[PDB]
């Protein structure tokens, strides 16, 4: 579906229509480092915050999944991916949910676009 890139440039996150978030460590494998299948509908967008170690996935089920991903330059330190929040209460119109998600360049603010014409600013 969509892709996002870590600011360090060594990590890629792939959103899929198969309800999967794919974390790739470019120095680890051409295979996905982790696969996550929490969404109930097709996942639309994945975005990494440019500064803070948080990334989010927006899907058509209306739920926005917020993950904390910590990345260290060390070879031993594999990236630490943990669930942090599951933002809900977003409408679905014509079986279309969270279409696009964007991160504030400075602080942990998430802009979510729904199918009903509403923009949610999760603080």
């Amino acid at each position: 579906s969509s892709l996002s890139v870590h600011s360090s440039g060594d990590h890629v996150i792939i959103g899929s229509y198969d309800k999967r978030l794919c974390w790739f460590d470019l120095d680890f494998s051409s295979k996905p480092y982790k696969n996550l299948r929490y969404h109930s509908r097709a996942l639309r967008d994945v975005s990494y915050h440019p500064s803070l170690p948080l990334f989010c996935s927006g899907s058509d089920d209306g739920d926005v999944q917020v993950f904390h991903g910590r990345v260290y330059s060390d070879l031993l330190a594999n990236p630490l991916i943990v669930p942090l929040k599951i933002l809900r209460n977003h409408k679905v119109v014509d079986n279309v949910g969270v279409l696009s998600t964007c991160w504030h360049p400075k602080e942990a603010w998430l802009f979510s676009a729904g199918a009903g014409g509403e923009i949610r600013m999760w603080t």
Binding site: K34, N35, L36, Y38, I81, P83, I86
Partner: peptide
């Protein structure tokens, strides 16, 4: 704490043993 304890199912497939939590 309970919500994060119940929702921590990282990529594990067969290691996911929530069958016990669903019956017992």
């Amino acid at each position: 704490e309970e919500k994060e304890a119940k929702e921590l199912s990282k990529m594990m497939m067969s290691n996911k043993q929530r069958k016990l939590y669903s019956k017992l």
